[PDB]
Amino acid sequence: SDLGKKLLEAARAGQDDEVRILMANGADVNAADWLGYTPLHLAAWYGHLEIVEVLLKTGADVNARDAYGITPLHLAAYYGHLEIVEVLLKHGADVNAQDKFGKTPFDLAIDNGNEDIAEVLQKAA
């Protein structure tokens, strides 16, 4: 929607208070862009911990897939956001999720030298 598209942008940009307002206003927490990126995907990708938290509290799908089979946990692992990895894990993120290239979050963590995140994902495997 309009609200959906504004939630995707607010979540990407890390506009905490704009996200809360958009959601009191009935913005779809699982609104998806043309590749299937949800607000939760973009907040995980760009490292906005408080936004990840409000989205999960408001019913964001923790294991939403983009068109290339990417999950929020993949993005938090790839882009080195350890706290977001631990929050997504605690909310039921699929540690063994494979994207359409066969990569797990663990694999993207290793590919980007994020060894801390790889260890947390391995111990959660």
Partner 1 sequence: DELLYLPVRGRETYEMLLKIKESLELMQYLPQHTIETYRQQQQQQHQH
Site residues (CB under 8 A) for partner 1? 34-36, 45, 67-68, 70, 74-75, 78-79, 99-103, 108, 111
Give whichever of 110 and 124 is closer to partner 1, judged by the CB atom.
Answer: 110
- Shortest Å distance, C-beta 80 to partner 1: 12
* C-alpha pair distances (Å), 83 with each of 22, 25, 59, 77, 102: 24, 28, 19, 10, 24
Nearer to partner 1, 14 or 46 (CB): 46
CB-nearer residue toward partner 1: 14 or 80: 80
Smallest gap, in angstroms, from Cβ of residue 87 to partner 1? 20
Closest distance of CB 14 from partner 1, Å: 17
The DSSP element (H or E) to which 23 belongs, if any, is helix 16-24
Q: Which residues of 22-60 are buried (b: 16+ CB within 10 A; e: fewer)?
A: bbeeebbbebbbeeebbbbbbbbbbbbbebbbbbbebeb
